[PDB]
Ligand binder design. Structure first.
Ligand SMILES: CO[C@@H]1[C@@H](OC(N)=O)[C@@H](O)[C@H](Oc2ccc3c(O)c(NC(=O)c4ccc(O)c(CC=C(C)C)c4)c(=O)oc3c2C)OC1(C)C
Length: 347
């Protein structure tokens, strides 16, 4: 039942505004992209206060539950991250979805969380034309305001394109008429490269790496920027960790050890000078994406990754990869080392 959600909405979403509800719907479309089924996601914010999310994924199954004898889509919508789309339906005066699947376009409507129609066959489409679109009308009585924080949504949607290479994410704000489109073929590297295009850095095209250990998967892009504002973003299962944490500590620790060993072999350290992790990390710009099973968060807001396992995993990945890179790019390596050494010497 959805009654519990209606009684205490604050326990299932952020009642400040409907942004979180939109996130839930967006996440479901992103899963299709992460699974390699969707390549396009469009979000529309309407003047009537509703929000729609459309994707070209497989589309929600349009079959009937043998026991419940009702559409599988109905069970999903009638029965913070990963709370489920049912929460969106429960806190909306109306929800309308269109599903393109198996050569047909289907429609279903809900009102105040209850089915307001049957699963209707409303169109015929090509076999390859599939996807889901869900539009919801948040019930203002549950939120301080029905208005969306568009800026926060822009940042979040861009992250999806960054974290899922090849995915095109669009946003359309009907109130203003403003449109946005994000796409990053390479993912992390293209995004970081574009965000730092105004400053000179080492490597010029960044230092990239990745490692998969059957459950743990890490991806990163980093560079040293002598002058300029640094971009520093980390994620765990697509969840942004504003306070970074154990995964970032691993990256930092691993790049530091590689650089220190490099300075040792090349004998670049001035008399009595030793590199401290802060010397190496001070001018670093990066984007880090970790994927692990059941991550644990710490901090007064759970915006920091606490999983100790993640530290050792990434440290080993960054250590081995950066050592390899430095040893095959000596000049670039010595310039990076010098940036860190200049800090150490300046102390
Ligand atoms: C809110 O629905 C979300 C989806 O939302 C979006 N935007 O696509 C998406 O996040 C994901 O969608 C899935 C998740 C799993 C399968 C999946 O396992 C499929 N393969 C099947 O063989 C299948 C075919 C019919 C059927 O009733 C079921 C069981 C239904 C499930 C597991 C939801 C599975 C399939 O064709 O489509 C799938 C789809 C579209 O999971 C949902 C349904 C909770």
């Amino acid at each position: 039942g959805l009654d519990p959600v209606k009684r205490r909405p604050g326990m299932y979403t952020d009642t400040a505004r409907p942004n979180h509800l939109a996130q839930e719907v967006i996440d479901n479309s992103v899963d299709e992209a992460l699974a390699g089924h969707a390549k396009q996601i469009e979000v529309t914010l309407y003047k009537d206060g509703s929000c729609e999310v459309s994707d070209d994924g497989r589309g929600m199954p349009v079959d009937i539950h043998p026991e419940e004898k009702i559409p599988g889509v109905e069970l999903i919508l009638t029965r913070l991250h990963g709370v489920g789309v049912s929460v969106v339906n429960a806190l909306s005066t109306k929800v309308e979805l269109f599903i393109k699947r198996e050569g047909s376009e289907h429609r279903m409507e809900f009102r105040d969380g209850n089915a307001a129609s049957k699963l209707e066959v409303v169109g015929t489409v090509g076999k390859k034309n599939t996807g889901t679109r869900l539009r919801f009308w948040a019930d203002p009585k549950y939120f301080d305001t029905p208005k969306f924080n568009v800026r926060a949504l822009r940042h979040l949607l861009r992250a999806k394109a960054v974290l899922c290479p090849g995915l095109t994410v669009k946003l359309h704000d009907e109130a203003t008429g403003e449109q946005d489109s994000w796409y990053f073929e390479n993912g992390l590297r293209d995004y970081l490269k574009g965000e730092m295009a105004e400053h000179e850095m080492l490597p010029a095209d960044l230092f990239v790496g990745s490692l998969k250990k059957d459950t743990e998967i890490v991806d990163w892009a980093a560079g040293w920027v002598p002058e300029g504002e640094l971009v520093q973003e980390s994620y765990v299962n697509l969840i942004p960790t504003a306070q970074h944490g154990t995964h970032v500590n691993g990256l930092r620790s691993g790049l530091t050890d590689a650089l220190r060993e490099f300075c040792d072999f090349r004998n670049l350290l001035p008399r009595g000078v030793k590199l401290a992790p802060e010397d190496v990390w001070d001018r670093v710009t990066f984007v880090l994406s970790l994927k692990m099973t059941d991550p644990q968060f710490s901090g007064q807001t759970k915006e920091r990754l606490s999983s100790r396992q993640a530290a050792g995993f990434i440290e080993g990945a960054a250590h081995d990869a950066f050592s390899l890179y430095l040893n095959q790019n000596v000049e670039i390596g010595e310039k990076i080392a010098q940036i860190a050494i200049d800090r150490a010497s300046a102390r």
